[PDB]
Amino acid sequence: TDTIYHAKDAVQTTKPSERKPRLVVFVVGETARADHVQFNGYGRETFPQLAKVDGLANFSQVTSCGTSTAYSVPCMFSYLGQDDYDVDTAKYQENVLDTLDRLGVGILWRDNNSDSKGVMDKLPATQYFDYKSATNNTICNTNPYNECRDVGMLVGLDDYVSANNGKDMLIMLHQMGNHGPAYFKRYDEQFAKFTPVCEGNELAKCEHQSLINAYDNALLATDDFIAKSIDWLKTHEANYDVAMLYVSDHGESLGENGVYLHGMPNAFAPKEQRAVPAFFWSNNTTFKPTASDTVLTHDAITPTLLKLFDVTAGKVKDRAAFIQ
Ligand SMILES: [Zn+2]
């Protein structure tokens, strides 16, 4: 087909009509720094809603595959691992979502950031939706920049769960998160906790604390979005076994040594551009997460996903996952 396969041997050991069906939300983040998370020692409570969630596992030692929203995302769903990962040929490799779609799991990708980078290309166009425009995202008139909001991705998922009744389901929500240099645009007035913030076009011209405040506000918005995801998943506890996974595609630099956005090559990228937060919540002791401070990378994503849907592929039975 011109596709290079890696998991043709993959097999789902237990099916939806052998046990309770499983519904999972994978929230793909952007620009979130692990060292700006309270659970990892940050001095501000940037995730106050997740702090009150029972069964929520935080991961403090996760490193990203790359430093950009073009390099890390295809690697997050790749089978190869960042060592063997090549970005020029990633679009053509079989990835975890291809494998899961083959095994009967409903894949759904809602994107409020840019695109899937190619992860959803081999899948029918009816499974990818653009939520950056008001065409699909119902929440775009809550701020004076008229930017569509991440929580708009939650509206109308009950109908997807209804149409796919009794199916294993995986839902990727691609966050706008903490992107771009205009951090002050990324959140609504409900989250303007820290002040002042930087409105400037040039980050170098900002006062450092203003930039920090804007970034932390956007982190508050993300915290709220993840929490609302978990609540939504709770509205389906009765019929499905539910779980939520959050990873950021990379970190961000905020003036450390005059460095200000992301994008630097891994060989020279500072520590802040690769340390990302990772969260995992499950209603059920069905899955038991690995230890908090286990040293992990994006290579843990693809095993995790497979483990969630009881899939066995030969390539990734030696891999560290987020669950045991
Ligand atoms: Zn990014």
UniProtKB/Swiss-Prot annotation:
Domain of life: Bacteria
GO BP of this protein: lipopolysaccharide core region biosynthetic process
Disulfide bond positions: C65-C75, C140-C148, C198-C206
Binding locations of Zn(2+): E30, T69, D249, H250
Bilayer disposition of the protein: Multi-pass membrane protein
Main localization category: membrane
EC number: 2.7.8.43
PTM note: Phosphorylated at Thr-69; may represent an intermediate in the catalytic mechanism.
Reactions that this protein is recorded to catalyse: lipid A (E. coli) + a 1,2-diacyl-sn-glycero-3-phosphoethanolamine + H(+) = lipid A 4'-(2-aminoethyl diphosphate) (E. coli) + a 1,2-diacyl-sn-glycerol
Subcellular location: Cell inner membrane
GO-annotated cellular components: plasma membrane
Positions of post-translational Phosphothreonine modification: T69
GO molecular function: metal ion binding; phosphotransferase activity, phosphate group as acceptor
Residue ranges that the Swiss-Prot or TrEMBL entry lists as coiled coil: none
Keywords, in A-Z order: Antibiotic resistance, Cell inner membrane, Cell membrane, Disulfide bond, Membrane, Metal-binding, Phosphoprotein, Plasmid, Transferase, Transmembrane, Transmembrane helix, Zinc
Stated family: Belongs to the phosphoethanolamine transferase family.
Subunit structure: Monomer.
Function according to Swiss-Prot or TrEMBL: Probably catalyzes the addition of a phosphoethanolamine moiety to lipid A. Phosphoethanolamine modification of lipid A confers polymyxin resistance. Confers resistance to polymyxin-type antibiotics such as colistin.
Protein name: Phosphatidylethanolamine transferase Mcr-2
